[PDB]
Symmetry: C5
Subunit: 82 residues, 5 copies
């Protein structure tokens, strides 16, 4: 899994029916790093540090084994909680 | 998933039957970046910025759990 | 599979329910390399060198074909054989 | 999917039984780039530019969901 | 699939039971390249150039669709530079 930060919500799109209403977020490992897009399975806001899963796990994490995702946020990271 | 841009249509006449008639597009993260090829499941043209999915999800995104794809366009993006 | 070292525990109180109670660990191929996170399926401590599996094998290794993992620690490496 | 060129046939006499008799070819994104190996599901020769799929799609592309491939040639690109 | 050279055996005494008794080998694309670990399904020795498969194919390649592997040696390369 990857540690990434939420930059912004991906709204400016028209996409496929096989994807539902779960939000898409633009994420990166840090500012300036290459951007990716993840399905938000938790409920995140810009600036949140999030745990991201790829591969097959990303699909069922997004809510279905049939979900079109290869990157899904499955947790919010507590930077300071120990 | 990754945002990419469509450079051009990929022409491959000799290809396996499992691919069917789905259009294949050459895509890149940006001009000059490594070229990859994606199945277009939306209907795109050169210059379009597109949302692409890989892994297992690219197959069913292309229209079947058995489809031979590891990269599929699942959306067009305006603002890039 | 990758050879990585455990740096520390990753705390995510708000994570999806399918993760159960599995511990998550911050791992890297060496200090300074990009950090990743793996589910601990062995019982590891910081400083341990660990064998990590990704792809679909990470899921069942973490305890279920339905488990949300793409990186799972499946062994501790005895570096001084 | 990636665009790659066939360099040569990969000869591996001692390989697992699951591989059958499918040809294996050494491929690269261009000369001098890191070499990889793909199962040839099309019928290629050295010099061919080819379309290759990875991930789980490579297996069924090679002919079976149980086939041991993570990289399969699924087309010949008309521009060589 | 990758062409790699076998460097040495990977000793992991504390590893998940699903691994069985399959040998694990340290492999790299060339000396000095990043080390990975593959399950040996052929029977290899150090110095061998080997064909390695990853992704989901590595599992059944290692003996079972349930096997915890994302890198499996599935062939020995005849005469390799
Ligand atoms: Cl994969």
């Amino acid at each position: 899994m990857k540690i990434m930060q939420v930059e912004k919500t991906l709204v400016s799109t028209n996409r496929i029916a096989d994807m539902g209403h779960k939000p898409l977020l633009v994420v990166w490992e840090k500012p300036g790093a290459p951007r990716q897009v993840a399905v938000d399975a938790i409920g995140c806001i810009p600036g949140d540090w999030v745990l991201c899963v790829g591969s097959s796990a990303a699909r069922e994490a997004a809510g279905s084994k049939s979900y079109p995702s290869d990157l899904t946020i499955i947790g919010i990271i507590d930077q300071w909680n120990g």
